[PDB]
Design an enzyme around this catalytic site. Structure first.
Site, PDB file in Angstrom:
ATOM      1  N   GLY A  94      36.664  40.063  40.889  1.00  0.00           N
ATOM      2  CA  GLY A  94      37.426  38.950  41.417  1.00  0.00           C
ATOM      3  C   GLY A  94      38.682  39.354  42.159  1.00  0.00           C
TER       4      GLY A  94
ATOM      5  CE  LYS B  63      40.014  35.461  42.987  1.00  0.00           C
ATOM      6  NZ  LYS B  63      40.049  34.095  42.409  1.00  0.00           N
TER       7      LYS B  63
ATOM      8  CG  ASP C 112      40.884  31.088  40.517  1.00  0.00           C
ATOM      9  OD1 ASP C 112      39.951  30.364  40.928  1.00  0.00           O
ATOM     10  OD2 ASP C 112      40.944  32.315  40.742  1.00  0.00           O
ATOM     11  CG  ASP C 113      44.981  31.800  42.657  1.00  0.00           C
ATOM     12  OD1 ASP C 113      45.966  31.629  41.911  1.00  0.00           O
ATOM     13  OD2 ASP C 113      44.336  32.869  42.701  1.00  0.00           O
TER      14      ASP C 113
ATOM     15  CG  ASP D 205      44.182  41.340  43.607  1.00  0.00           C
ATOM     16  OD1 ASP D 205      45.089  41.448  42.756  1.00  0.00           O
ATOM     17  OD2 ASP D 205      43.223  40.554  43.479  1.00  0.00           O
TER      18      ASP D 205
ATOM     19  CG  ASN E 173      40.661  41.897  38.662  1.00  0.00           C
ATOM     20  OD1 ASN E 173      39.967  42.657  39.338  1.00  0.00           O
ATOM     21  ND2 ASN E 173      41.303  40.861  39.186  1.00  0.00           N
TER      22      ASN E 173
END
Lengths: 468, 468
Positions: B10, B41, B117-118, B228, B256
């Protein structure tokens, strides 16, 4: 009259692959170039283990590449760099080199080159009893190889002292270069890189000084866009600083591209224009290069309706991506411009940020009753800086949505890092601008992500000397 | 009692390829892990264009990947993040999501996840006229999707407030989390990341506090090795700071990894050990991980002498490569260790360099006539620093010779930057040490190349204030 113009794959890093090289050949033919030199630094059978012979699968790779080059009528030069451990007085070494070159020729290769760059200046005891000088041994072995190969039309030799900084005590009086010029056969062309390893500019007088020794016109090995001496730097600016009057006085120009394959469109296009001009304006060349380069980004991926939902006035809009614009590419070029200077926009942003930082304490805290003109000027300049930062972030965002993601993924790290640092600086500027009514410490979230910076690299960079 | 333990893809950036994923599956089976979550992503059909249907070639790749996962008995969870633009009160969106998930199911996939998310916290007018709250709409659509799929055994849901720092006004009193916990079906698992997006450590009481709201044990989405959010950072250190007492109180742990595929080996291994302990010592886990990792480097490429040249007493030695050793890997680990701390050796090198810099005036100018003890101490510490810099350079040189170069090639840039900066620091330290008898400027070549270190990003970074 013949002239050489092309590219040299001689950078450190992961070497390019067959597909990339084929696309490079197609582009070179489109841009009317004619030379590709194959001397990758990290090819074990090129430099480190030159004595070994190629295998059947490597043979197929080389044959396919050479045939593809013949299809597009681009000259292919194969280089060998045995200077690491070759013994000049041993006939077995000469025979091994001859056999290796014969194996290369058997595939259909036509042009060959010998490189002695980046080696020591010493010789073994055995060679001391045969050759009076290091240059003597190098020239003798090169001449023997040239005679054996059948005197091909094209042949390149790189002297150990490939730049003025490596000549002692100077270019004119170096015994190495004088011996080379006296003893090297007339049929061989010599590589040269200018006053320095990465020459910012090349005056004609230095080239004439070199010519007065080597008794022949040199071939320029230009590292103007090389990025293997500090790999944190990307270069996308146009070919600049080399005068076109050198073209009649040179046998050829060969460029070292960036390690990343897809980042060398602009440099190669500008080089092609520079050569073609006078068989020149760096700004116009860059503009034309970016205009042509925009075509290969295509269009951003969009939802394809080629029964589909269409929203109404009360419904959230469908996700849409803006196309990549010329301004975005110009800004990207200015952000990664040249080894010795930045673009006008990046330099202007840096100067403006430095000015804003300098006069922060003028109006930051409790500035009521002070000069209103200073307050307004500082606020306006801060707003313009904010706009520039937003432009950079929008450039990254729009580039992220390109359908052809190959261009971005080969240079993802640099653009992502620069947009992250621009965001951090924007946050810092906002915190500076809010001091008069907010006393909070500068923070992104609840902490300081910039304190860590680039880990150990950044912490060591913070302690290096500065002019101020 | 089933427990989830594995990896989540991710991160932003260039996504992993099929070969890498297959090798990852083999490694996961070796290390006794059981979960892989697929939510890259930058996959356009994952998040930004979820409404589109997979093509035939993509379908074949997905079926091959799922079958390979079946071979290694690794659970495969497929995630969708429609929250970017989905409208909750329009049945067409729900039908499209159902069709997409059914297409995924017909490939043989078994487990599905929905992520919000986000995203933004706003709602369109169409949804505000139907749902009382944002959480209400999210939970309703998730429940309907869960019931349509046939209630699979495994199902993951990521709330919009996935960390404590995003909870308003706090964790226990957040209306969003309370509504989610009350209205979510009991059969769904809930992702959580701890107090912060990148949590340095997880106190036990925080997990209990979250569970008192979600009424169920969560599944940890750990970004301890995510890189990231600032892509200049590489993390090779072990899994640290997570107490084993959380294991009974958690439904699973999912890590992650770093963007670079081959750089996560150690991390994943450490995680397995951390799990396998309590179905723990970070130092021992790291030692074991590096010991296992070294076996994949094999041996460096060497000349193949299967009529073979053998040098005599006075002939130049052949190029010989040294193998990569445990100490090189430990030094590499310490150089790129953790988001919130460095390795002991790198931190000690930095402290020693800072001390040497601080006490330059002891012997910089006219050292003769000053106190001998200070001179000896400074010189000795400088010598030790020089030796450590030489160790770093030797590490890079030996790593460059590995036969299986791929392990290096995915993280070439970081090691290359750190070795370049170590070389520059060594030169600077030498210049400092020779000032008393050499008054020349502290130059490298004829210039100070670090004036262009990092380019524009480096220049902007250098101006950010820090306390130290």
């Amino acid at each position: 009259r013949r002239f050489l113009c092309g590219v040299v794959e001689g950078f450190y890093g992961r070497p390019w692959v067959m597909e990339q090289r084929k696309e490079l050949f197609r582009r070179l033919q489109k841009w009317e170039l004619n030379t590709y030199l194959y001397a990758p630094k990290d090819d074990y059978k090129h430099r480190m283990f030159w004595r070994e012979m190629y295998s059947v699968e490597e043979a197929e790779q080389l044959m396919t590449l050479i045939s593809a080059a013949r299809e597009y009528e681009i000259e292919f030069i194969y280089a060998i760099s045995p200077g690491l451990d070759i013994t000049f007085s041993n006939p077995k070494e000469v025979s091994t080199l001859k056999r290796k070159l014969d194996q290369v020729s058997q595939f259909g290769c036509r042009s060959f080159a010998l490189l002695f760059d980046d080696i020591d200046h010493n010789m073994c005891a055995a060679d001391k009893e045969v050759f009076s000088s290091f240059a003597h041994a190098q020239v003798s072995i090169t001449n023997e190889i040239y005679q054996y190969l059948g005197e091909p039309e094209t042949f390149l030799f790189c002297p150990t002292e490939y730049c003025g900084t490596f000549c002692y005590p100077n270019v004119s009086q170096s015994p190495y270069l004088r011996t080379v010029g006296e003893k090297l056969l007339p049929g061989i062309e010599v590589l040269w890189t200018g006053p320095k390893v990465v020459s910012k500019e090349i005056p004609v007088e230095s080239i004439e000084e070199v010519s007065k020794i080597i008794k022949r016109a040199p071939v320029i090995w230009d590292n103007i866009h090389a990025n293997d001496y500090d790999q944190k730097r990307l270069f996308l600016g146009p070919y600049k600083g080399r005068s076109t009057e050198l073209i009649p006085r040179l046998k050829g120009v060969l460029t070292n591209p960036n390690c990343e394959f897809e980042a060398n469109y602009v440099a190669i296009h500008t080089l092609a224009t520079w050569y073609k001009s006078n068989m020149y304006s760096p700004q116009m060349a860059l503009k034309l290069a970016l205009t042509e380069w925009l075509q290969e980004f295509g269009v951003p991926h969009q939802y394809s309706s080629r029964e589909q939902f269409v929203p109404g006035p009360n419904e959230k809009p469908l996700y849409t991506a803006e196309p990549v614009t010329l301004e975005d590419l110009q800004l990207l070029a200015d952000l990664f411009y040249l080894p010795y200077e930045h673009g006008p926009k990046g330099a202007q942003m840096l100067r403006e940020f430095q000015w804003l930082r300098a006069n922060s304490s003028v109006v930051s805290v409790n500035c009521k009753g002070k000069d209103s003109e200073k307050i307004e000027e500082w606020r306006s300049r801060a707003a313009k800086f904010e706009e520039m930062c937003g432009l950079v972030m929008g450039m990254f965002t729009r580039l992220s949505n390109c359908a052809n993601r190959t261009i971005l993924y080969d240079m993802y790290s640099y653009v992502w890092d620069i947009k992250s640092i621009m965001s951090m600086v924007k946050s810092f500027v906002q915190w500076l601008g809010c001091r008069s009514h907010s006393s909070a410490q500068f923070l992104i979230g609840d902490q300081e992500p910039w304190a860590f910076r680039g880990g150990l690299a950044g912490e060591f960079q913070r302690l290096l000397p500065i002019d101020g």
